[PDB]
Structures are given as C-alpha cells and as structure tokens.
Symmetry: C3
Subunit: 265 residues, 3 copies
C-alpha cells in the first residue's frame, strides 16, 4: 500500500510514533497505520467528555442550563474561557463549548466532576462498546504522555469508531448528536492540523490534543460535498520536531489521506 | 434579605466560610447563603452512604440482616459502636444506625466497602441527579478539609436538594425512606447544633460533620407542627473559634432561619 | 463439627490462616471455617474477571473474537501465553483462556482494561449481589497479600456463593456459563491442590491463586458422579511452610471435606 509507505516515511521524518485511522461511512472502507496501538489522547478526550454529558442530559440527569460556579484556586493552565467567569460561573453547555472549541482545561475538570470523574467517563465508553479507550487522571496530569504508560490512552481505530457511533449511532438523541457536531465544527484550535490539509469545500469538525514528549493529536469528522462523513484520528507522540512542524505532520497526514482516497474513486 | 446580612455578620464572627441552604417543601421557598460554594462535607456524607445502601436493599442486591465481621486492625478512630463488636460483627442495618446516630467511622468504611468504594457512592449520587456531590476517600482521610480541595465536598444547595429527593422523592422504597428518616431522627451527635436552635415542638432528624481547618457541619430535615418538611444544610469551615463556639454558630443559624421564616408569615 | 476441629489443627500445621467454604447445591448445605474472614484473592479473581467479560459479550458490548495487541513493555511477570503473541496479539477468548487455565498475568491486565479497571470488576460483582469481594489493583501489585490490607480480597463464603451464581444462576447466558465452566475444567495450574485430594471420578474445574506472605488459594466447582455441583473455596495466607507443603494443605482440605461429606451421606 502506497499510503502506508508514505506515512512510514512521514513518521520517520517526525522522529516519533505516528498513528492514523480512517473510517469512510459511505463505503465502509477502513485504513489504519498503527491504528491498534495506544497513544496518549490528551485533550482529544474532551470530545468524548461532552458526549457523556449530553447522554446524561438525554437521560434527564443533567441540564445544559445548570450553572456551575468555581473559584480562582480551581483554575488550571490553558483555561482561556473559564478564567473570565470566576465571578459568574458558567453553564454546562458553556463549559462543553469551551472544552471543545477552545480546549479549556478547567472546563474539562468541571465537566469531569459533573460526570463523577475519569472512571465515569471510561464507564460511559464501555457502555457504548468502546472497550479500548480509558481516562485515568484529571487536568493537567492526563497530558504527561509518558512512553509505555497506558493511562489516558486510546487507539486511532477505536477513537474513529467511537465518534462514528457517537455522531451517527443511537447513543445520543438527535438533538445532542447535532449539538456535539456543532461544537466540533466550531473548534478554533485546529486550523494548523487536519483542517490545514483538507480541501476547502470539506465540512470539518475536529478536536485537538497536545501533550508532553512531542505529542500532537487531531481527530475529525469530515463531510465532503454530497458525501457521507469520513472519520479521521491522527496521533503523533515522541516526536523530535518542534511544535509548528508537528502540526504540519498532521496537516500532511490529511493531504496524504485525501490523495489516497481520490484513487479509490 | 435581612437573613443574608445576619448570616454575613455571623460568618464574620466565625472567622471562616459559612454555607447555608434552606428548602421548604410546603411552599417551595428556597434560601441560600453561599449555597453554591463547595464545602468539606465530612461525616454528613454518611446520610448519603446509608441511602445508597438502602437503595441496594430496595434493589435486593443487599440485605439489612447481612452480617459483616472485622478485626480490631480494621478499626479507625472514633468508632464507638464498631469497637464493641470485633468479636461478633454487626449487620448492615446496625452499621448504618451506628454510622448515622453515632457517626461511627469504621461503620462508614465497612458500608463503603459494601458499596464498592467512594466512587460507587458518587455514582449513586449521579444516578439520582446530584451532579455536584463527590466522595473520593475513606475514613478518616475524607475529613482533612483542606481549603481549595474539591475532594469529598458538596454544596449546601446540592446537599439539601439531594436529602429532599432521598427522603421525599421516589428514589428509595417507602420502607427505606422511613428507615433513613428514623435513623436521622435518632441521631445522638447533634444536640448542640441545629437541634439546639430549633423550636422544641419540631420533629428533627440530622447528621453532623466535623473536620480539620475548623470545620463544623450539620444537615437536617425538620417537620414543624402540621407542616411539610424543611430541609436545612449548614456548613462551616476555616473558622477560627473552638469547637464549642463552632457548634454555637450552627445553633445560631437555626435560630436565624426560624426567625426569618416566622417573619415571612407574621 | 469434626471437620471444624480437623481444619483447626491443619491451619496450625500450615503456620498461617486458613479459610474454607463449601456450598453443596444438591442439599443447600454450607460449611465454613473462617468463611467470613477476608483473604487475598490473588489469581482466583480471574474467574470473576472472565465472567464479567462474558457478561458484556452477552450484552453485545464485547466480542470473544475481538483482537487485542500489546507491546513487549506491556508484559508483567508470570505471563507464559501472552509473551508468545507480542507480534500477532490475541483475541478476548484467547486472553480469558490464558488468564484462567495458565493464570497468565498480562492477559488479566488486558482483560481488566477491556472492563475499565479493577473498579469496573468490583462494580460487576456488586451488580450480582456480591457485596464483599473487591478488586483494587492491577497485576502484579494485587498479589501483595499484606496482612490487614482489605484491598484485592474476598471471603471464602462470598467466593463460593459468587462462583455458584455465576455458573448456575441467571447472571450469564447458558452459552457463557458453559464457556466459563469449560475454562475452569481445563485449568492446568491446580494439579497439586484441590484436584489432588478429590476422588478421581469427580469432574473438577478450578482457578488457583498464589501470592506473597505464603499465600496459596484454590476455588473449585466439583461434580461427583450423579450428584449436583459442589463449590469449594480454600484460602491460605501468612503460611510458614514452603510452596510444596502449602499445596499439600489445599489437597488435604479436599480430602477432609470429602471424608466429612462421606459421613453426611452415611
Ligand atoms: Na472479628
């Protein structure tokens, strides 16, 4: 396969370990490069976090309008949205929007205790047939991305399959599926990653992840024109190139994937 | 409200952080002073622990007559009932009664074991719509009550609303609801707190909490004569006065809330 | 009871603490020697781990054919099967077979991950009415078997009753019940323990456990000829004799139990 050889070369240039999974729901075709290896998910877990909250909203156990207040001691790093509402708090819906579109870390911590902690998120994932993904820690510790540590990891194939189930399955109500899609489409953190390499007329929703040990992740749902959605999970870790080059690797994966798919047609 | 100002002055005299929530089920009237701030709940969680046990009994995954045995090495501090039954053990019902009416710490640990741990209690609370309260540790570490630590915390408003759903809603069976009510009414540890400030003809059940960093708590269900229950959750932490004065702060909160309620009518 | 006196003297020969539980499903008779006390499970938990995985297969949330891959660095000690499939991985069914019949430790960790962790296994046991057994750690730490540590423990009576409900109750589908039975019957690690002392015409399935502090365990389901199943949970810890002599204690428990049952019938 030419795409696998292309990704192996791109992986070698990055100096780290690269994981790619593609799921085309029009064809059923799947592609994987290290698709069944574990990678630190980092903030890419926040897409699953909002899904578990929306499921509880569907169950009548949670309300998007419920207001959550907090103090300045509850703020952790990379919280550009929650740092502004120490005085008035934020609603659950506003916290999910901040956690997805701005990768707000404190918002994720507040939503995690709304669920009951990382084990509750893992249990929700087990409840929908994801027997692979696991969340173990809170922010910011879940971003350590140490080699050999299975904590807070997923595989590209499992993540892509889980999002297909979340966005297109019967797990969430039609209202919450659309809300999760709307949040991912409105992401502001991934202009340099998968979105950069995708054709401009593609409708894209995505959630990014960044961690230590040169970790750069991006997960997307892609709607080509008059085309069923394509799910894409890219994970890069242990890489030796700088932050901008790691983003370009993700963008390069997008270009390689699209160019592999123009051959299938 | 004059009550908010009165509690502000009482909070000032306490030197700490005071949290108050009132839930009046006869009218629907609610009141809160820092009702949405997190407080170390300490032993007040044992009311929710017993409810989670009773829910599993209603579930017939648990039996109130089931006997649990333990050794002296399993005893933690302040366990006045469980320390007397190292030889013969205690039933689940006896452990719940000991955990509520005497705030027995080892009894709480054994019941947490019967649940499957603090995360199992949190999961039960999430199953009944409490998205705020969390238990994270066992006895006695859950009582460290460090400022800024969200572990083992609740808010006054959440605890009052959860106590209401457990005692009035249909989370528990009628028999289980009456049993939890009976345990709370039979409490022996809270005579100097909310009970002290309430009118004598009030039917009251309560659960106390005490911890480090000058922490003194009390949650209660109060039935005035010919009156639907009123749920009351009071949390004091970081206070700078001794334990006797902290109990007096809780008793004064009951006096102020009652005085505010009678002024609401006459 | 003579069997109680006999187990008492045998316990003292072992130099440690001995726990025995018998559950005869033909008559309902149950026997216990320290059947209420907690013992470190060690690998005996893997029988419950496979049941929890089989329950999810019944629910359609897991597939026995699902392949799991792992790396060289993921292997822990005592992993005779998993160490040969770093390249090709293994299916869930293959991991359950290795975890049960060879007591493979890495296979158990991979299956614990498929569940969501030790707390997920404990939650499954609470869901079927086992309010006693708890798993807290992963391999190999769960085999520490420190005296007084309630982590990763069960009681003989709870394990026998749980094994009974898993193999004969409505928890699992008949297909997964038969699969769990077939795995236990195919165990390769218990020839020197309970199986050694049982009559040769008995059909036996078992799961062994071994840990530090001289811990030697074995749980079994025993089919005598034309007789309903008998469940037997034997736990030994803090033993002062070597590994072979600890194995011989378990075999002697089987001999003592069978002889006592011979007296029950005649
Ligand atoms: Na004892």
């Amino acid at each position: 396969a030419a795409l696998s050889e292309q990704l192996a070369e791109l992986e070698k240039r990055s100096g780290g370990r690269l994981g790619v999974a593609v799921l085309d729901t029009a064809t059923g075709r799947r592609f994987g490069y290290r698709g069944d290896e574990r990678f630190p998910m980092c903030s890419t877990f926040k897409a699953l976090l909002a899904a578990a909250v929306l499921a509880r909203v569907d169950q009548g156990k949670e309300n998007l309008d419920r207001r959550i207040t907090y103090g300045k001691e509850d703020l952790v790093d990379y919280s550009p949205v929650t740092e502004k509402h120490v005085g008035d708090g934020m609603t659950v819906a506003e916290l999910c929007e901040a956690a997805i579109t701005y990768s707000d870390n404190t918002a994720a911590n507040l939503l995690l205790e709304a669920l009951g902690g990382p084990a509750a998120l893992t249990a929700f994932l087990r409840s929908i047939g994801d027997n692979v993904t696991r969340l173990d820690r809170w922010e910011p510790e879940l971003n350590t991305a140490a080699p050999g540590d299975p904590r807070d990891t997923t595989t590209p194939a499992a993540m892509a399959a889980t999002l297909r189930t979340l966005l297109l399955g019967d797990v969430l109500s039609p209202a919450s599926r659309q809300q999760l899609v709307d949040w991912l489409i409105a992401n502001k953190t991934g202009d340099k990653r998968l979105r950069a390499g995708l054709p401009a007329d593609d409708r894209v929703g995505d959630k990014t992840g960044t961690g230590e040990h040169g970790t750069t992740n991006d997960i997307a749902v892609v709607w080509p024109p008059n085309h069923a959605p394509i799910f894409l999970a890219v994970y890069l870790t242990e890489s030796q190139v700088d932050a901008d080059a790691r983003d370009a690797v993700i963008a390069e994966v997008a270009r390689l994937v699209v160019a592999a798919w123009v051959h299938h047609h």
